[model samples]
Target: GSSGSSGFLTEFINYIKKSKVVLLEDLAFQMGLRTQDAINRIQDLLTEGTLTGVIDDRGKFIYITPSGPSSG
Candidate 1:
């Protein structure tokens, strides 16, 4: 019982959520993925509005959590 495909996505999300600030390369290493693969996953998350952050010119992913009242 080791499907574990979705495991990577879960781990990726958890790492960013906890760290808040992480380097793109570092994140890829932690997830045992190539930099481009990690980037692809990150893009998917961003498009889905599941994760929020910006990549700086220096190649860091800054995780942003929504705080305060909802704007709806």
Candidate 2:
């Protein structure tokens, strides 16, 4: 049994797991997120208590640093 995730968060996580890194813009487009909404959610993911993110040089890219606790 499972309750689904909102929008592209789960898909983004899968991409990260597969590639180990990704640019935010690419992620947004791949997720089909509206520009502003993608930026907002990205901020949320960065500052969220359970998750951590790293922005690479010039802030051109973002990646999750500490991905933790998937529901059982």
Please tell me which predicted candidate would have the highest TM-score against the true structure: 1
lDDT of 1 by residue, 22-62 (tens): 87788778767888888888888988988878888887778
Segments of candidate 2 deviating more than 4 angstroms: 1-7, 64-72
Q: To one decimal, what is the Cα RMSD in angstroms of model 2 from the true structure?
A: 4.7
Q: Write the residue-wise lDDT of candidate 2 on 4-61 in tens digits.
A: 7664577665666556566667766876776667767667866774345666565555
Task: Give candidate 1's error at residue 13 in angstroms.
Answer: 0.8
Q: Each model's C-alpha lDDT?
A: 0.77, 0.61
- What lDDT score is found at residue 42 in candidate 2? 65
Residue 22 CA displacement from its true place in model 2, Å:
1.0
Count of backbone clashes, every candidate in sequence: 0, 0
